[PDB]
Amino acid sequence: NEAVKTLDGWFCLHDFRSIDWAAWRELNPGNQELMLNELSHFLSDMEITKNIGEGEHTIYSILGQKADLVFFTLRDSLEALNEVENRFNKLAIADYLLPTYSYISVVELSNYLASHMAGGDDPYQNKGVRARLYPALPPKKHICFYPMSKKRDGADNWYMLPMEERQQLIRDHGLIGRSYAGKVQQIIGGSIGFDDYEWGVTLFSDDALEFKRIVTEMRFDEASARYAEFGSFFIGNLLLSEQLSKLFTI
Template sequence: FMALAPDWRTLRTLQTSLQHAGIDIVDSYVSITEVSEYAKGMPEHMLQARLHPQIPPEGLNAFCFYPMSKKREAHANWFATPYDERNEMMMEHGKSGRTFAGRVAQLVTGSTGLDDYEWGVTLFAASPDVIKDVVYTMRFDQGSALYGEFGAFYVGYLDFIENVL
């Protein structure tokens, strides 16, 4: 399962409680909400929505989480690519994502220095097939196709902890 909270202490307490209940923690991922450098110029209310997202989004109970980084290889180094080119690729990526507006909500979190990958991406939709469609579509964007490195994908349905335990 996946647990989200506004502070790490709450999550650590949950993890300890689960372990004391005899539940093995097989994986974890640590990241925090952030605003991308490519979101400069967005209206303040949109920036605040990225920093303090409303979770879970109403009616979007299927989720997918995956970590990702950008490549640093000789033939494909995201961070050696000029900012304007990276920004253009991110604009293309955003345009692809907006075709799913209203059907998919995303939460992008930063994990540089906190975990093995640089970002965590969580997608919410009414069903897993919509998530599959958006991931399939966006993998053809230049920024993903040339520079994306992805970890394991975790898929499930949202529910409140009192309904799960």
């Protein structure tokens, strides 16, 4: 009956793309170089915004046919995020990066558990809270993304549960997640009102098998076993600018 409340940080876009190798193959090397030069300029623009504290971004190569690349971008406004989107699509090389999936969310800190001492202070001025709402992206070797929702299915209805019961379920969920400290970092984007599921979940690790371990362990925790609804899963490997030229060289 008591709705969850959230603190909300950067707006987020997960932008998945497949490379149109057949078309790219037809460009002569000089034109490929010009397009990669322009992309490097765009990416340095991204880096400038990161270095003044106004957003974040990273790129991972995606395994399988769902995508070749994910561009994960965070900005302080939907206007800025959409401007990045348009600037990217207007790049010459974007004609060769075909959209296969996207997700819009906002970094979310819910109030199921406390993130700071109660008592009148502005949480947005708490620098530990800020480090979570406006997260620096760890350059971990692997990324995992998937959206999810909470079930509203007969006797398994998360949104009919009272606050104290949801708090208990989230608390137990967090005990598992905290046991992966130093092995898995999570960024939770809330997407109710913004996209097709209720959260977009990003995990970072140097060992992709930690994704399998934590997701499996949580699936036996009642919060997920009874109430999790999952979308598609995407797994990838860190892709640094220095590796893009190689990737786009046939």
